[PDB]
Enzyme design. Structure first.
Site, PDB file in Angstrom:
ATOM      1  N   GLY A1308       0.817  -1.194   0.000  1.00 54.31           N
ATOM      2  CA  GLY A1308       0.000   0.000   0.000  1.00 54.31           C
ATOM      3  C   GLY A1308       0.856   1.250   0.000  1.00 54.31           C
ATOM      4  O   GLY A1308       2.074   1.197   0.173  1.00 54.31           O
ATOM      5  N   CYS A1309       0.188   2.383  -0.197  1.00 58.70           N
ATOM      6  CA  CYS A1309       0.883   3.660  -0.252  1.00 58.70           C
ATOM      7  C   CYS A1309       1.357   4.073   1.135  1.00 58.70           C
ATOM      8  O   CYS A1309       0.552   4.231   2.057  1.00 58.70           O
ATOM      9  CB  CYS A1309      -0.033   4.731  -0.842  1.00 58.70           C
ATOM     10  SG  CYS A1309      -0.918   4.220  -2.329  1.00 58.70           S
ATOM     11  N   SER A1310       2.666   4.258   1.271  1.00 60.43           N
ATOM     12  CA  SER A1310       3.306   4.659   2.524  1.00 60.43           C
ATOM     13  C   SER A1310       2.904   3.735   3.672  1.00 60.43           C
ATOM     14  O   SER A1310       2.435   4.163   4.726  1.00 60.43           O
ATOM     15  CB  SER A1310       2.991   6.114   2.860  1.00 60.43           C
ATOM     16  OG  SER A1310       3.644   6.995   1.964  1.00 60.43           O
ATOM     17  N   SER A1311       3.099   2.439   3.443  1.00 57.37           N
ATOM     18  CA  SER A1311       2.827   1.445   4.473  1.00 57.37           C
ATOM     19  C   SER A1311       3.980   1.328   5.463  1.00 57.37           C
ATOM     20  O   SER A1311       3.756   1.205   6.670  1.00 57.37           O
ATOM     21  CB  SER A1311       2.537   0.089   3.827  1.00 57.37           C
ATOM     22  OG  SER A1311       3.346  -0.112   2.684  1.00 57.37           O
ATOM     23  N   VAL A1344       2.772   5.752  -4.088  1.00 61.30           N
ATOM     24  CA  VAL A1344       2.904   5.157  -5.408  1.00 61.30           C
ATOM     25  C   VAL A1344       1.643   5.448  -6.212  1.00 61.30           C
ATOM     26  O   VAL A1344       0.546   5.608  -5.670  1.00 61.30           O
ATOM     27  CB  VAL A1344       3.173   3.644  -5.327  1.00 61.30           C
ATOM     28  CG1 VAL A1344       4.598   3.390  -4.880  1.00 61.30           C
ATOM     29  CG2 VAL A1344       2.190   2.990  -4.374  1.00 61.30           C
TER      30      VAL A1344
END
Ligand SMILES: [Zn+2]
Length: 1400
Positions: A1308-1311, A1344
């Protein structure tokens, strides 16, 4: 005949002689023959009384003496009764009953005097016989022997049994009533009580108290038994044609008795009060007085129970009617002391009932009133809610009118009790109880000094009531309140008064033990404030080990809470005090840090409040049972909860944890909103503003400050309070809590102004704070002097005012660094240092901060360049000593931000002079907040337990698990013990940034290589001298992220694509600059060593020659590490090494190094190994894993060095199965598209995730927490492809509660990103996953744009899942970075957290 009667005198003399022979001789069965002889003598006495015609008084006295002798003999027999003589006592009692009937007959026609003398002898004999029989448990026999007495006694008119001994009458009546109750005679007991009351009728009601108490007891036994007819058969109907005033007095006494009993008595009191109202008239001012008193009692009854339908009256209406009646009454001079305190009780209950109505209304109001890309700030948004308008709906000016009632009640009670004359009030007990409730209420509303005034009056009553327990209790409360304010000396006199009053009690009651324990705890506390810690620890240990502290009772729970708070106070002391022996004794109880003790105290308080008033008050989702002390305890518990929350918030804010502090602050704000108290709301709002400042949220803090100003202007019945004179009497100045809130306001305003760049105004405000604090302290001293009247300004008065001044001094000195030219504040450092030095063990963290400022001021570079050995192509002693003494101050419980500065600065200063100390200091400066949270989590788990791995992990993480001595001998011993535990084949590298300014980012990088069976190696890289600084890279990275966010929102895709390509080129340039411009030649320190012999020989030979060449500090390990990779050494980095290490003869060193590289060329085979990276909060954002040199190695990053040791411990105790047996590709749980915002990802990943083996999955909706619960605890591979890490379903707190037994692939985005707000350390879900014990965690570093993360995921999954039996995941992670079209924009996002994981 007469001769026989004369012989009967000789017979009596012979009987007396026999009794002398029978003295102490229990006749046993021969007592029957003695009784037969006595019966013959009684027949002779009847004949003599016939012949008597003191004619008969002499014979009566002789018979009385004989009966007394027989009674004494029977008493002796019953003393030696045992099992058998009780049967003989039956015949003895039959004979004594015949004799008692004869005596009752003789007592007839006793005229006078003898009517109180002969009947007195009969009563005494009956009392002795009844005592003997009842003591032998012969209830039936005693009742039979006592029936003739009371029967005629009660039946006789008042003239009979005149002025008879009430105690003797009570003795027989009490015995009979108790026998009936024990036998459960029910009705018979009630009628006997009626006869008891009738016989004693012509006397004052205190003689009637016992019958009434027995009546209430029997009625309540009928209540438990289910009987109600008795409860119907009340005093009114029972007494019938009695004098109405006596009946009213008896009903009032019965009402007080019902108040005393420990049972729910709502309906009975209602019936009694209604009957009182019916009996009272309404045509006489005495009737008005009685009606008013009955009305205040009815208000007390209705204020907690719901009887509206059958009374058709509200509590407020009844109390206002009572108030009008009381104000209308014109009193008489002797009875004014009752009108006083009648008005006081009425006003106090008015306040209580209005508060209850407000609480119910607020509860009902609150009850009925009820897709961003990254989830980095989801918990912050969830915590925040909209209730600031409720505060506007909260500060209504009715509060002054509400508090006016309490103030007037206090004034009236003060006027009543102050005078020396003994009060004429009927019941002082109720006055004392109401005074206690008033003091508790005054404490609850944050009015402490007025509460103290009430407590002094309560002690006065205790002396008048001669009840010693309440004097000790009140004195203990006074001492506790005085110490909380911060006056040490005035606590001791009241403590000694409590100690003196404690003696006059039995040494077996629970009261004695509780009071002694409380006094000892107070003594221990007093030692803490007066520098007597050595015996304070002994007293605390003796209190803690006492087994009576654990007894199940609400009184002991509060003592436990105070004990826990004192434990927290003791756990905040530097290691110089006490000794090693006492430290593990104190820690052996099970509390290692102050915050743990504070959290336990808070939990205990919540558990207490749960048992008393349900749970609707604390949170939105029983009965109060007013019992006496329950009323006081409710307010006491609420005030204690508020105080504990304030302490917890302050301490957690100081430590560096802001999320938990905000949670506690919001909970306290909700509680204060429900009760409608602005004074506590202002303090908690200011604390919330201070917390918000540390997160850099200026507008929210400004809004909270505006709210604080509005509330302050609401209760005051550029803000105006700055212009107040040093001496004042306004509400803000009269109270210390409000003054503290006002002083905090200016501090937070100055902080905001300094943050906004408006300098020269923040300094102006901070000068105001600094000036104001001591003047406030002096006014509080004067106020306390006036109230207690010892007439001697007591020593010092330390308080929370000291902490405010310390932080103000800290901020002023810190601002002093950034402007070095202003001399006016260049003495503030010295002034603050003196001020702090005065209180050594009380302001230690502030002293540490000031010492760090002093060190950086004396810094004035190359100054630290003589301690290391590589120079890029005494003051030190003073700095070292000062930093050492500062380090020892805060080591036990360090703040999360100052500790790193101290550690890294000292590590810079020490250098290669002590490699072990340097390595320890560098290791001890990363991930401290995580360490605090892990300690708290471990305590939670251990408390859930009622283990050996948990104990060892606690030892490894504890701040006090070390020996004593100088610096750093215990530190070095502990460090070497830790180093010996390092697993083989693992190289650990620590990358930290050395910051000169304590608010900005520095340009110095520290590198440390730790290995098994190798001394540590450390080095420093300055980057300020060359272009492309570290700050340049950080700023460029932030600019690239912001540019990506800007380019994301567009319409035409030409410009989109062009921007993406340019951004990818920029990121590639940044990645190259990381390796070629920052690390330089020292890239070799991050590569595996060599095992083939020959590098060691070459290193030794080179060391011998280079020692002469000019190497200031010669290290063989450094040369070995650098030459283990001799193949990759370029000519330029060889030149850099030779020039840096050897400045004396650089040319010779270059030649020798070149020949050595030539010799070692080719014969190098680096082998299996593993590298762990430890990064600080700013360097974690950069993609270090994607450097060209590290694109061929397995690399993982961990929060700290102790985590690797913890993994080793868990592996040795065989808990974690993944690192022992290997991730099995059979247990997989995937979450796909929680909310349907993505379309193509589902289409691509549906089939690739469906046709598998054992892959349970949920796709389409939001998974419920139970599914992810079991998918993380029990499964082996958890994959989430939705937006964000998934904090919406499984928040961090839910994760911490678990045991992590799977590998989490969060795509995921900025996990994996850690949010850096201000100077606070990073926060994220990855930290919680590592705390739960996750073998591996994978996630993206920046946001992303999708459609390429798809390709990366596909490549990685296909490769690793088709690898085969067993393979390292890190290899395929590094191999999968080439799939996406944008190799550096999207391929560089993923990172790995944990330890290497392979399949079977
Ligand atoms: Zn004022």
């Amino acid at each position: 005949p007469s001769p026989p009667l004369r012989a009967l005198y000789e017979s009596c003399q012979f009987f007396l002689s026999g009794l002398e022979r029978g003295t102490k001789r229990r006749y046993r069965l021969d007592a029957i023959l003695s009784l037969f002889a006595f019966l013959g003598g009684y027949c002779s006495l009847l004949q003599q009384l016939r012949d008597d015609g003191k004619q008969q008084q002499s014979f009566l006295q002789m018979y009385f003496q004989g009966l007394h002798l027989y009674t004494v003999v029977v008493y002796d027999f019953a003393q030696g009764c045992q099992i058998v003589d009780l049967a003989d006592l039956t015949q003895l009692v039959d004979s004594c009953k015949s004799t008692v009937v004869w005596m009752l007959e003789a007592l007839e026609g006793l005229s006078g005097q003898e009517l109180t003398d002969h009947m007195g002898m009969t009563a005494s004999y009956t009392s002795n016989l009844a005592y003997s029989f009842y003591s032998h448990k012969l209830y039936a026999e005693a009742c039979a022997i006592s029936e003739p007495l009371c029967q005629h006694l009660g039946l006789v008119k008042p003239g009979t049994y005149p002025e008879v001994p009430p105690e003797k009458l009570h003795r027989c009546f009490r015995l009979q009533v108790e026998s009936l109750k024990k036998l459960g005679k029910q009705a018979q007991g009630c009628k006997m009580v009626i006869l008891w009351l009738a016989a004693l009728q012509p006397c004052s009601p205190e003689h009637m108290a016992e019958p009434v108490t027995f009546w209430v007891r029997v009625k309540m036994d009928a209540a438990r038994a289910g009987d109600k007819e008795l409860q119907l058969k009340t005093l009114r109907d029972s007494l019938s044609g009695w004098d109405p005033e006596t009946l009213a007095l008896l009903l009032r006494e019965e009402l007080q008795a019902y108040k005393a009993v420990r049972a729910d008595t709502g309906q009975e009191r209602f019936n009694i009060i209604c009957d009182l109202l019916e009996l009272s008239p309404e045509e006489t001012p005495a009737g008005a007085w009685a009606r008013a008193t009955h009305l205040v009692e009815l208000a007390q009854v209705l204020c907690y129970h719901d009887f509206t339908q059958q009374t058709n009256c509200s509590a407020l209406d009844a109390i206002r009617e009572a108030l009008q009646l009381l104000d209308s009454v014109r009193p008489e001079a002797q009875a004014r002391d009752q009108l006083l305190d009648d008005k006081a009780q009425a006003l106090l209950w008015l306040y209580i009932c209005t508060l209850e109505a407000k609480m119910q209304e607020g509860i009902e109001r609150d009850r009925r009133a009820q897709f961003e890309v990254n989830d980095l700030n989801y918990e912050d948004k969830l915590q925040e809610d909209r209730f600031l308008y409720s505060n506007i709906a909260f500060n209504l000016a009715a509060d002054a009118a509400q508090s006016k009632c309490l103030d007037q009640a206090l004034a009236l009670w003060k006027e009543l009790l102050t005078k020396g004359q003994a009060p004429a009030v009927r019941c002082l007990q109720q006055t004392a109880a109401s005074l206690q409730i008033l003091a508790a209420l005054y404490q609850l509303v944050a009015k402490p000094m007025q509460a103290l005034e009430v407590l002094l009056l309560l002690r006065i009553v205790s002396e008048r009531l001669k009840d010693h327990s309440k004097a000790a209790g009140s004195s203990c409360h006074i001492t506790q309140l005085l110490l909380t304010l911060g006056c040490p000396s005035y606590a001791q006199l009241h403590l000694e008064e409590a100690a003196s009053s404690l003696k006059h009690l039995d040494q077996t009651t629970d009261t004695y033990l509780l009071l002694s324990l409380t006094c000892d705890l107070l003594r221990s506390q007093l030692y803490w404030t007066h520098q007597k810690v050595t015996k304070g620890v002994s007293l605390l240990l003796s209190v803690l080990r006492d087994p009576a502290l654990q007894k199940s009772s609400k009184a002991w729970y509060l003592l436990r809470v105070q004990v826990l708070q004192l434990v927290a106070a003791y756990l905040s002391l530097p290691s110089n005090n006490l000794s090693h022996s006492l430290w593990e004794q104190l820690c052996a109880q099970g509390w290692q840090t102050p915050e743990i003790a504070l959290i336990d105290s808070h939990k205990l308080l919540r558990s207490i409040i749960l048992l008393l008033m349900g749970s609707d008050i604390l949170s939105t989702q029983t009965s109060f049972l007013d019992y006496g002390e329950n009323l006081v305890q409710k307010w006491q518990v609420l005030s204690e909860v508020l105080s504990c929350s304030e302490k917890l918030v302050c301490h957690l804010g100081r430590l560096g944890s802001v999320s938990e502090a905000k949670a506690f602050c919001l909970e306290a704000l909700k509680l204060t909103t429900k009760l409608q108290i602005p004074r506590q709301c202002a303090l908690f709002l200011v604390l919330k503003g201070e917390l918000e400042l540390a997160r850099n949220d200026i507008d929210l803090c400004q809004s909270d400050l505006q709210q604080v100003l509005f509330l302050l202007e609401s209760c005051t019945e550029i803000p105006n309070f700055l212009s107040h004179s040093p001496t004042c009497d306004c509400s803000l100045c009269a109270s210390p809590v409000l003054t503290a809130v006002c002083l905090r306001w200016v501090l937070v305003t100055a902080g905001v102004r300094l943050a906004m760049g408006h300098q020269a105004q923040g300094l102006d405000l901070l000068q105001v704070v600094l000036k104001g604090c001591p003047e406030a302290a002096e006014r509080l001293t004067q106020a306390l002097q006036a109230s207690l009247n010892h007439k001697t300004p007591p020593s010092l008065v330390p308080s929370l005012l000291d902490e405010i001044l310390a932080q103000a001094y800290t901020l002023l000195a810190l601002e002093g660094l950034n402007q070095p030219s202003n001399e006016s504040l260049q003495k503030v450092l010295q002034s603050g240092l003196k001020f702090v030095a005065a209180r050594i063990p009380h302001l230690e963290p502030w002293r540490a901060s000031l010492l760090l400022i002093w060190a950086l001021t004396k810094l004035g570079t190359q100054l630290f360049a003589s301690s290391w050995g590589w120079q890029p192509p005494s003051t030190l002693d003073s700095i070292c000593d000062s930093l050492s003494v500062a380090f020892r101050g805060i080591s036990h419980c360090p703040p999360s931000g100052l500790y790193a500065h101290l550690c890294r600065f000292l590590a810079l200063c020490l250098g290669h002079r002590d490699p072990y100390a340097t390595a320890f200091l560098v290791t001890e400066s990363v991930s401290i907040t995580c360490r605090h949270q892990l300690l708290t989590h471990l305590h939670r788990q251990l408390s859930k337990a009622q283990d050996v791995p948990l104990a060892r992990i606690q030892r490894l993480f504890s701040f006090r698990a070390l020996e004593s001595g100088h610096f750093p001998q215990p530190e070095k011993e502990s460090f070497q013990e830790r180093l010996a535990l390092i697993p083989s084949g693992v190289t650990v590298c620590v990358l930290a940034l050395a910051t000169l300014q304590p608010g900005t980012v520095g340009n110095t990088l520290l590198l440390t290589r730790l290995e098994k069976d190798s001394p540590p190696v450390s080095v420093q890289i300055p980057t300020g001298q060359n272009k492309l600084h570290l700050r340049s890279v950080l700023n460029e990275f932030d600019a690239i992220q912001k540019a990506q966010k800007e380019n994301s929102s567009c319409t035409d895709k030409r410009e989109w694509w062009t921007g993406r390509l340019a951004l990818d080129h920029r990121m590639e340039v940044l990645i190259a600059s990381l390796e070629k411009s920052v690390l330089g030649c020292w890239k070799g320190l991050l590569l595996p060593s060599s095992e083939e012999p020959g590098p060691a020989q070459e290193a030794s030979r080179l060391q011998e020659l280079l020692q002469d060449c000019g190497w200031k500090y010669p290290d063989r390990t450094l040369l070995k590490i650098m030459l283990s990779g001799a193949g990759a050494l370029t000519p330029q980095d060889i030149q850099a090494l030779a020039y840096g290490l050897c400045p004396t003869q650089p040319e010779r060193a270059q030649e020798l190094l070149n020949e050595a590289v030539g010799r070692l060329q080719g014969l190098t085979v680096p082998s299996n190994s593993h590298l762990v990276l430890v990064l600080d909060k700013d360097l974690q954002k950069l993609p270090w894993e994607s450097m060209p040199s590290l694109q061929a190695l397995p690399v993982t990053r961990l929060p700290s060095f102790r985590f690797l040791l913890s993994y080793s411990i868990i592996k040795e105790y065989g808990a974690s199965p993944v690192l022992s047996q290997g991730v099995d590709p059979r247990s997989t749980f995937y979450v796909l598209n929680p909310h349907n915002n993505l379309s193509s990802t589902e289409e691509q990943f549906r089939a690739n995730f469906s046709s598998e083996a054992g892959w349970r999955g949920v796709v389409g909706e939001v998974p419920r927490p139970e599914q992810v619960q079991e998918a993380l605890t029990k499964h082996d591979l958890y994959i989430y492809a939705g937006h964000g890490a998934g904090a919406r379903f499984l928040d961090g707190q839910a994760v911490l509660r678990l045991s992590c037994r799977a590998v989490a692939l969060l795509f995921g985005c900025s996990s994996a990103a850690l949010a850096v707000h201000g100077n606070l350390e990073g926060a994220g879900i990855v930290l919680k996953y590592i705390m739960a014990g996750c073998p591996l965690f994978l996630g993206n570093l920046w946001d992303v744009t999708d459609r390429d993360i798809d390709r990366y995921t596909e490549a990685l999954l296909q490769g690793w899942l088709g690898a085969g039996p067993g393979a390292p995941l890190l290899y395929y992670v590094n191999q999968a970075r080439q799939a996406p079209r944008l190799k550096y924009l999207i391929g560089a996002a993923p990172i790995a957290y944990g330890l290497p994981v392979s399949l079977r």
